[PDB]
Amino acid sequence: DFHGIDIVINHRLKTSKTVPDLNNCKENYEFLIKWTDESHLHNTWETYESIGQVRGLKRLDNYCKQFIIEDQQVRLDPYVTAEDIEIMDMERERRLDEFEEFHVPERIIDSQRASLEDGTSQLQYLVKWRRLNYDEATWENATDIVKLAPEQVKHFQNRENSKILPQYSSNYTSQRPRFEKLSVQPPFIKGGELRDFQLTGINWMAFLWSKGDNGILADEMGLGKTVQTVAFISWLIFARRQNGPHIIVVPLSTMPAWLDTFEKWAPDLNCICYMGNQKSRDTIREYEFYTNPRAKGKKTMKFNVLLTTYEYILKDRAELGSIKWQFMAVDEAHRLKNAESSLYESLNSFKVANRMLITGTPLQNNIKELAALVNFLMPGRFNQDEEQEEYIHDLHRRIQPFILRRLKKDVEKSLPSKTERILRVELSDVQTEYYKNILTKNYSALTAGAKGGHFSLLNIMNELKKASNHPYLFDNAEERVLQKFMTRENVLRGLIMSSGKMVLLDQLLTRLKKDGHRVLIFSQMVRMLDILGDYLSIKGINFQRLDGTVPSAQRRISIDHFNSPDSNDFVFLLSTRAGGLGINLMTADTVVIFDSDWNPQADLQAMARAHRIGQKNHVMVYRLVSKDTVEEEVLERARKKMILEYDMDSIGESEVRALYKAILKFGNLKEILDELIADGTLPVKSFEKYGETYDEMMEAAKDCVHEEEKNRKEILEKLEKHATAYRAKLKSGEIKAENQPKDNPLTRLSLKKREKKAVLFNFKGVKSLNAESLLSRVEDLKYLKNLINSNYKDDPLKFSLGNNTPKPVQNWSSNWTKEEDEKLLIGVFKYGYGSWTQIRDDPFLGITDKIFLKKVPGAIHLGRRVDYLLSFLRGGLN
Amino acid sequence: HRYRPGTVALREIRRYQKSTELLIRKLPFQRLVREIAQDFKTDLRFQSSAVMALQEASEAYLVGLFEDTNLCGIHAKRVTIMPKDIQLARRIRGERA
DNA sequence: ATACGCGGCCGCCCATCAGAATCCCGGTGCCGAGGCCGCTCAATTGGTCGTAGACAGCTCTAGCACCGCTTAAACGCACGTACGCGCT
DNA sequence: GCGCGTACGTGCGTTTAAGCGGTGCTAGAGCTGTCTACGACCAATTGAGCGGCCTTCGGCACCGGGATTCTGATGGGCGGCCGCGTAT
Numbered sequence A: 001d002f003h004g005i006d007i008v009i010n011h012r013l014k015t016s017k018t019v020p021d022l023n024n025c026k027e028n029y030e031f032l033i034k035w036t037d038e039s040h041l042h043n044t045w046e047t048y049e050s051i052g053q054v055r056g057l058k059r060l061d062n063y064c065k066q067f068i069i070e071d072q073q074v075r076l077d078p079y080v081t082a083e084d085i086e087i088m089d090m091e092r093e094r095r096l097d098e099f100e101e102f103h104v105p106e107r108i109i110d111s112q113r114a115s116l117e118d119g120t121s122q123l124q125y126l127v128k129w130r131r132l133n134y135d136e137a138t139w140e141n142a143t144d145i146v147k148l149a150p151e152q153v154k155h156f157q158n159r160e161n162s163k164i165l166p167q168y169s170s171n172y173t174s175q176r177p178r179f180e181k182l183s184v185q186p187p188f189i190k191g192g193e194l195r196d197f198q199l200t201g202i203n204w205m206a207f208l209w210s211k212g213d214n215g216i217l218a219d220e221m222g223l224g225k226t227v228q229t230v231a232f233i234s235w236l237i238f239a240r241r242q243n244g245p246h247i248i249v250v251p252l253s254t255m256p257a258w259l260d261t262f263e264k265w266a267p268d269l270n271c272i273c274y275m276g277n278q279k280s281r282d283t284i285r286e287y288e289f290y291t292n293p294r295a296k297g298k299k300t301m302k303f304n305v306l307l308t309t310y311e312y313i314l315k316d317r318a319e320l321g322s323i324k325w326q327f328m329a330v331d332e333a334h335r336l337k338n339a340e341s342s343l344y345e346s347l348n349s350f351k352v353a354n355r356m357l358i359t360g361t362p363l364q365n366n367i368k369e370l371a372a373l374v375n376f377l378m379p380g381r382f383n384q385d386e387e388q389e390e391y392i393h394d395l396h397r398r399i400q401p402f403i404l405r406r407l408k409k410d411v412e413k414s415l416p417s418k419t420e421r422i423l424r425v426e427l428s429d430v431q432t433e434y435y436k437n438i439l440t441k442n443y444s445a446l447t448a449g450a451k452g453g454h455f456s457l458l459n460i461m462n463e464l465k466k467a468s469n470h471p472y473l474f475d476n477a478e479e480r481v482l483q484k485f486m487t488r489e490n491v492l493r494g495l496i497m498s499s500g501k502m503v504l505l506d507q508l509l510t511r512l513k514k515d516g517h518r519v520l521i522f523s524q525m526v527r528m529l530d531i532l533g534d535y536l537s538i539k540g541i542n543f544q545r546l547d548g549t550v551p552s553a554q555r556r557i558s559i560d561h562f563n564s565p566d567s568n569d570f571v572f573l574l575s576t577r578a579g580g581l582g583i584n585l586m587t588a589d590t591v592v593i594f595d596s597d598w599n600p601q602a603d604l605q606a607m608a609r610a611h612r613i614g615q616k617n618h619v620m621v622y623r624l625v626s627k628d629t630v631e632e633e634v635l636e637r638a639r640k641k642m643i644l645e646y647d648m649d650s651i652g653e654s655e656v657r658a659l660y661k662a663i664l665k666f667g668n669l670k671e672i673l674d675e676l677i678a679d680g681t682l683p684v685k686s687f688e689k690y691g692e693t694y695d696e697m698m699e700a701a702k703d704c705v706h707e708e709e710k711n712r713k714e715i716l717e718k719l720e721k722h723a724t725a726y727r728a729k730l731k732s733g734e735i736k737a738e739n740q741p742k743d744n745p746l747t748r749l750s751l752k753k754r755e756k757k758a759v760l761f762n763f764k765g766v767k768s769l770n771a772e773s774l775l776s777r778v779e780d781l782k783y784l785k786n787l788i789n790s791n792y793k794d795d796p797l798k799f800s801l802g803n804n805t806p807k808p809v810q811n812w813s814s815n816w817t818k819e820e821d822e823k824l825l826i827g828v829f830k831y832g833y834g835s836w837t838q839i840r841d842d843p844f845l846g847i848t849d850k851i852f853l854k855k856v857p858g859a860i861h862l863g864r865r866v867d868y869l870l871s872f873l874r875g876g877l878n
Numbered sequence B: 001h002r003y004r005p006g007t008v009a010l011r012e013i014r015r016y017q018k019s020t021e022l023l024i025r026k027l028p029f030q031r032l033v034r035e036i037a038q039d040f041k042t043d044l045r046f047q048s049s050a051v052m053a054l055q056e057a058s059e060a061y062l063v064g065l066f067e068d069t070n071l072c073g074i075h076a077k078r079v080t081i082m083p084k085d086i087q088l089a090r091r092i093r094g095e096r097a
Numbered sequence C: 001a002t003a004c005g006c007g008g009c010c011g012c013c014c015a016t017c018a019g020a021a022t023c024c025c026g027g028t029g030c031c032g033a034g035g036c037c038g039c040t041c042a043a044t045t046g047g048t049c050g051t052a053g054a055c056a057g058c059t060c061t062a063g064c065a066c067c068g069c070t071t072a073a074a075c076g077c078a079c080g081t082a083c084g085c086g087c088t
Numbered sequence D: 001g002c003g004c005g006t007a008c009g010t011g012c013g014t015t016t017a018a019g020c021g022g023t024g025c026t027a028g029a030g031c032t033g034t035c036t037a038c039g040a041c042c043a044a045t046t047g048a049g050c051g052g053c054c055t056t057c058g059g060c061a062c063c064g065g066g067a068t069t070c071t072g073a074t075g076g077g078c079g080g081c082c083g084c085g086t087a088t
């Protein structure tokens, strides 16, 4: 809550020897300080005698300590090379890059009007910033919010106004609406056009959507599978009017893709995710509800779509279980492999109506999953040499519906070709020693004998396999092949040499190196990847590693750095499960395999990340098959494994009470029918039923108005008729002017004309509806809407009074001048009569501390202000 | 909660008592055994429980130790378990010489 | 040229209609006796033989008691030193 | 560490009772000898007990509908705006 130091951003010199001391930083260095409990934007260049003891002293001191030594390792030493200068500077560069993106705001969460110490109340917006999670969103006032990010605020208003919540969805539960085959691409795809194998896919999902059955998407690894669901989500929303909060669970690795894939292919439905911890946990709930707590299940509804990591499912199984869901999406749904899964019966509790898995999981490896998939989508529903025909007569006829099988033979015609080469590498020197001695406890027990015991089986069928091609995976291996007792050439040579694979890779790599191909290494084991991390840097090839140990933010930075047009590193190393985890590589052509990934198909996706629709450089694949080892056999079983691959009644008085107020506020409301219904103001009735009632209601309004006027008109003529008759006597002298009767016609006429009494009628619901009040505002607003529309269309605010003079308001508390009126009118033109906080807060109007809803003018003062101006400039007071 | 002096000291004690979860982790312990068990014989296997059981034994074994240690410690005008406090306890029980 | 009229503005008490919140009645999930039961292999049943062990006879060790001459060991008290234990 | 206090070790004299070897007595262990009851064993029949498998009501803690209370725009009537405005 206090003003204390939060972090370090930037460091610079303050003033015009061998090592700067802290004093030098205090009397020669200025440092940019970000303050605690406050967004990035308010950063100050401050020293120590400038601020004194402030809570939090620790980060600057160390950072200065880092700074002091940094200074000794860029300019103050001759052991420094050319490249360290590059990194020591570089850090300055990147440290700011991760600091810059916080200034740009990314979403406005809510809007609160809070009071100040001068007695004023100002609008503040909860602002969310770029590539950061929901925490540390601090309130900022609206004055500059639109002054830097107008687009966010525009969109901020749009969602709140676009009444399309899960509150109006069509009752198709009992039964469905006949659905239609689409030819054309739906007027809801802004991202572009898709092709001739992405709209039909969609037409099947939506086609069995109307059956009450769920389906399996089994296409190739990356045939615009994601676009097919998002479009599937889009057309189930503006087709069958389903506002039903759709739940989608995707991988923590593959979601950021999805979001952009969701926010660029379909603007109009907003996408709020679930990816936080403790604090987030609250912010999700802030917007996940309306009006704080809610009796029953009466949440007003502020989202439809969400994205959930697989973690988070299980951490909070309960809250989702209660809320209803009827549509399910999941990414790479080969997870449900066994029927003993935790997410396998975790998903079953979430009251659901239709599901949607979408993965290319081969479904013949084990019959368990084949059955598990069928049991999971449809709880309840389920060899011999000569009964096999009988068997696939049952299996082919039943399995197909909830299945999709379709080959590339699509979009691959442009994409450059695919290819893979095997490698027969025979054994080495130190290699046999540990291919031969390890299958016993001879010299495996002499050196590292204590560990021998636990790894002894590890080494047999789940190591030899893994430690057959490369023996460097234990301790007593490194010096074994190096034949000497610091050397730099020899270590590089000694390590390349031991393995058949290391040399083969080093030469091919070199071979394409000069030709220009980007090469990929998929290794099964974490460490192999450091191993190479150590060698390739040494020989000077720019790279980055892709392990199982990396923050979402850090993972994301490099993946993009790599696919950018002008990236130097053609070497990129990845994991089997961590590599094929998700993502895509579109720049890459070559991929090389060290060892098969104890299984058929982990490789087939492993190449899928690199071999995708985009790649314009054919493709290249190398498999390093070890000879006279144990690698060979699995490779054969692997083969064995993949051998098979197959009207609401009428409007009641209260609505009539609802409609009447809305007209005084918006005037003709026939155009705005749905927006009001979406939110509280109106019940769901057909468009005409309201529209006709709207018209007769005025039709009732005028008839009373005219009839009354006519009657007074008739009497008024009668009184003047008498009035002249006296007038003759007055100048004749019969009655003298200075002595004329208390009561005489002149007085009777005066009271009669100065008649003041409201004009009233009934309307089968309301009591004594105001006839004149309705007729007067409907027309006055119609006129203001008409003039600015035909002269100030593109920009409302330029609106000007010019010469015409409306009354001066001398004694009102605050500055009042013609410009303020100019805005006041635009304000209603924008929000409607009678909502004035709306108008006062608006960042664009600039009226914010001139309104006081002893301080004038308040709510009625303005109400008085507009009726007078609008009549005035049309010539109504005639 | 009064002041702060010796405030948690007795607090944690109580919460730990009401609970009944293992004091020591159940992952380091698991290898510790596998590792020595090799030195006395080769090609070893382990029942899931067998360790679970040892953990139970051992934990319980130490607490018990400490429990006396404490007394000894008190005897001494001290609230501090000491390196020897351990020894006496054992010595008089008799495993320690 | 000079005096009268007023006009919306406004504080005022005074009236109407919707929304918030407490009480009157509630559904839901978890725990622990119940029931059902059924193939079956261990106890029970009826039964024979023989052998431990109860039991009575007997004798023959050793546990008790008892005494008095002899004296080492216990007793109680006097005096001071060198530890228990309290404080810092 | 140090200093105060006192209790417990070391001595001598007085005193009390163990230990010694002496005899006598009979109880209770140990032996011995005959009978027979009770336990092992083998047989055949029967249901208590174990694996296998899924039951139902009650209790903790989250819930549900209806009258009622408090906040907001509405409105005629008595007063005040002092400043532009028409008539003689």
Ligand SMILES: Nc1ncnc2c1ncn2[C@@H]1O[C@H](COP(=O)(O)OP(=O)(O)O)[C@@H](O)[C@H]1O
Pocket: A192, A193, A194, A195, A198, A221, A222, A223, A224, A225, A226, A227, A583, A584, A612, A613
């Ligand atoms: N059907 C499609 N129409 C147009 N562009 C597509 C289509 N499918 C994919 N893309 C483009 O290709 C890229 C990756 O899509 P895709 O290959 O389906 O994802 P994944 O890596 O999951 O397979 C996206 O950046 C997208 O712009």
Ligand code: BEF
Pocket: A221, A222, A223, A225, A226, A254, A257, A582, A583, A584
């Ligand atoms: F179809 Be993907 F790998 F997100």
